[PDB]
RNA sequence: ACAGGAUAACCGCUGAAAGCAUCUAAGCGGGAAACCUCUUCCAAGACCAGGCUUCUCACCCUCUAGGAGGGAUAAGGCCCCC
RNA sequence: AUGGUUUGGCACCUCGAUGUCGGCUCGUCGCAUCCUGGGGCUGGAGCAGGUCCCAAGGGUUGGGCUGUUCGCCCAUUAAAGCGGCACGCGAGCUGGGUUUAGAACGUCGUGAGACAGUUCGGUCUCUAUCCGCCGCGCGCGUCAGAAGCUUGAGGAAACCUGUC
RNA sequence: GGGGAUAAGCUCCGUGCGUCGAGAGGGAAACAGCCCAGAUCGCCGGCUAAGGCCCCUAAGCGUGUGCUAAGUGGAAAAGGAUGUGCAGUCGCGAAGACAACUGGUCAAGUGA
């Protein structure tokens, strides 16, 4: 029959993506693909055999058009008139990592397995991270030519 | 565009430093720094000027060419001799003088009015009715002159207040 | 698709090249090779690349 | 910057000012406070000073609290609370073991007293939220104190959260701002504060320099 | 409340395309009880479940020693009691 | 051209039940802004208005008459806004009106009777299962077991105005 | 085609018109009546239809030539409007064109 991963089959690696001057959607899609494990031939939608992804320089990320001051991030508290909106500009200047986190999280499945996969994403607004002990592998967003 | 194509002469006495697009000029009046838009580069013409070279003819570039040229011209003419604004009052009972580095007006309000001098400008008051401000940048001089002009609402009836020459 | 992109080729071009080369392994055993015998999958990728046209976008 | 002290609400009384007007004053035992710890940004991320107040027998303290007090270098006190400052410049005037007394304030100053409001138990909407009751006659049937309507009919379909209904009342931290200090009796460590301060007699309060009128 | 930030209508400064002009397409300023802070309160079940400290910091038995299970304790807590 | 805030048209929805108006109690939202805030032009001299923009934070009275909404009036006020939400809200209240059975007037009918004509009188049931919401606990978790003091992501409240 | 205000998710007729009724499967987010296609059963085989190929989500951040600045794409009219690409005309013009400062300076395009 088709191969199925067992208890100790999944092996995880660490990647770091430098978000400097990278389109938000492009980086978010690449990071979602890495987190889901779609790049591994042993992929199984049942299992979270993905990899740990580190994103540094989250505040340097590139947003095209006028989406910096015309795209809103919304949230409702649950109380009447509890709708709050911030543009990408102030959201970046206050919580730089939140833009990248929101974008990536919106691109992976909304099941419980997606909640588990979220745990393997670390984003940092600075150029450095505290995960040097894991020796992350630098990652470049390339496109396979056809 | 047509203005943009014309190189702006650089006097021999002003030291012009070009680092990519960041341009700095050290004139006798002082030093002022300008940044050039990316599509149009600036290279110091060896014959005593600089080159405003617009390589493309797309609308953005053809519109920014003349803007960059006239901005550079304003910069150089402001760093060699500076810029000066001449002001005055019309009416009666309005007195103006300079209190050290700060300006104090008496337009007739229940309170004295103070005007703060930012960097790069100085206040000249030779008479209560007429006074002047000078600076090395045209933009700050214009902005502060407008601010000082705003001290009275416009009078289309009698004309009390202040006006440019 | 994962194993093909690991060999610098897309799934669709790989399927087209395998069909052109005449190999008749179905997707079940292709995935089996991809998981169990990566060397065999790389060899099949090589033959598929060989069988592909020189300009895939040509009006051929 | 902003001063502060821990104290006890003693009760309310009456005094007359120099213009013969009467002043209702709450008496606060701004007892001696000892600085037990200093919060610094380099260590805790925020600047604050921690004060201790009250007297307790050393056999009533548990081992962890006694250890903290011993590490600080002072004998234990009943109450411990933190005063949040603004920056290390405001934190430099306190050191561990320093004693704070009522004279840090002056006559005529403005203060903010913080205490725990008196408990009211389970209270109805008329008491908890000032709802007007329904009629006491003219046919009203057993609705003399009930809230009445709760929501819409179809488009709401539910009850909005934050809707005001009956429940527990009181026992919450309350701050009264811009209270005037009528007199600072330094002998008894007593502050005469004009007005009413939260809580019951014998309750613990924090007196701080006013944030608006200071 | 005061104060600060970014803005609305609006008032402007420096000026191109369009040799002038143009508060504008490059930019820079002012500008409201609206918005963000600021005032008060809740808030780490904030699952990224945080921080600063302090206290205890140990003792057996069983199966087969792989883990587990059981017992007795410390710091501390609860019940009973006022 | 918008809207379904007016009367409409259709009858898809229910006749093995979807309470019909006002009022009270309690809301929430929009802005097409009544006051307060900021401006522009004045056929604006100042005052004061006209008029037009931006602005929804808060506020927006008490009575006489009528079942009323509506309306008119009386005193004020900074102002006495317009609307959505089963023309919000009867397992929250009323029962004055409408809408059973009694009786009477006018009118119609030979008559029994009738009248989107009037008049007087006339049972408003229920111990909350679930969601929702307001409060209060128990259990487990937060990689040993505890204890003090806390940062705050994130939320909630408050925001009125006059005279001198 | 009639009635209605050619308004209705209004109503009434004609149609070797369709589908549903009595029709599963795929697509249109969900979606009796729209599009593809008519399920005898099994298969951990292959090719396609409609519709698709950045991630959710299977397959192209496909190739080549152009356009768009409006997040248009990703709802709407009368009408208003120095946006821009392409093409076609004409007027004026090195005897010096337009602007700027009938005659002078100036210097290529300048007007509908």
From Swiss-Prot, chain A:
The keyword Zinc-finger does not apply. GO terms for molecular function: mRNA binding; structural constituent of ribosome. GO terms for cellular component: cytosolic large ribosomal subunit. GO terms for biological process: negative regulation of translation; translation. Keywords: Ribonucleoprotein, Ribosomal protein. Pfam families: Ribosomal_L13. InterPro entries: Ribosomal_uL13, Ribosomal_uL13_bac-type, Ribosomal_uL13_sf. The keyword Ribosomal protein applies. This protein is one of the early assembly proteins of the 50S ribosomal subunit, although it is not seen to bind rRNA by itself. It is important during the early stages of 50S assembly. Belongs to the universal ribosomal protein uL13 family. Part of the 50S ribosomal subunit. PANTHER family: LARGE RIBOSOMAL SUBUNIT PROTEIN UL13M, RIBOSOMAL PROTEIN L13. NCBIfam families: rplM_bact. This is Large ribosomal subunit protein uL13. It comes from Mycolicibacterium smegmatis (strain ATCC 700084 / mc(2)155). The gene is rplM.
From Swiss-Prot, chain B:
Keywords: Ribonucleoprotein, Ribosomal protein, RNA-binding, rRNA-binding. GO terms for molecular function: rRNA binding; structural constituent of ribosome. This protein binds to the 23S rRNA, and is important in its secondary structure. It is located near the subunit interface in the base of the L7/L12 stalk, and near the tRNA binding site of the peptidyltransferase center. One of its GO terms (cellular component) is cytosolic large ribosomal subunit. Part of the 50S ribosomal subunit. Transmembrane segments: none annotated. Pfam families: Ribosomal_L6 (PF00347). This is Large ribosomal subunit protein uL6. GO terms for biological process: cytoplasmic translation. Belongs to the universal ribosomal protein uL6 family. InterPro entries: Ribosomal_uL6-like (IPR000702), Ribosomal_uL6-like_a/b-dom_sf (IPR036789), Ribosomal_uL6_a/b-dom (IPR020040), Ribosomal_uL6_bac-type (IPR019906), Ribosomal_uL6_CS (IPR002358). The keyword Ribonucleoprotein applies. NCBIfam families: L6_bact (TIGR03654). Disulfide bonds: none annotated. The gene is rplF. PROSITE patterns: RIBOSOMAL_L6_1.
From Swiss-Prot, chain C:
Binds directly to 23S ribosomal RNA and is necessary for the in vitro assembly process of the 50S ribosomal subunit. It is not involved in the protein synthesizing functions of that subunit. The lineage of its organism: Bacteria, Bacillati, Actinomycetota, Actinomycetes, Mycobacteriales. Belongs to the bacterial ribosomal protein bL20 family. Transmembrane segments: none annotated. The gene is rplT. The chain holds residues 66 to 125 of 129 of the full protein. This is Large ribosomal subunit protein bL20.
UniProtKB/Swiss-Prot annotation, chain D:
Keywords: Ribonucleoprotein, Ribosomal protein, RNA-binding, rRNA-binding. Pfam families: Ribosomal_L3. PROSITE patterns: RIBOSOMAL_L3. GO terms for molecular function: rRNA binding; structural constituent of ribosome. GO terms for cellular component: cytosolic large ribosomal subunit. One of its GO terms (biological process) is translation. Part of the 50S ribosomal subunit. Forms a cluster with proteins L14 and L19. NCBIfam families: L3_bact. HAMAP family: Ribosomal_uL3_B. Belongs to the universal ribosomal protein uL3 family. One of the primary rRNA binding proteins, it binds directly near the 3'-end of the 23S rRNA, where it nucleates assembly of the 50S subunit. This is Large ribosomal subunit protein uL3. It comes from Mycolicibacterium smegmatis (strain ATCC 700084 / mc(2)155) (Mycobacterium smegmatis).
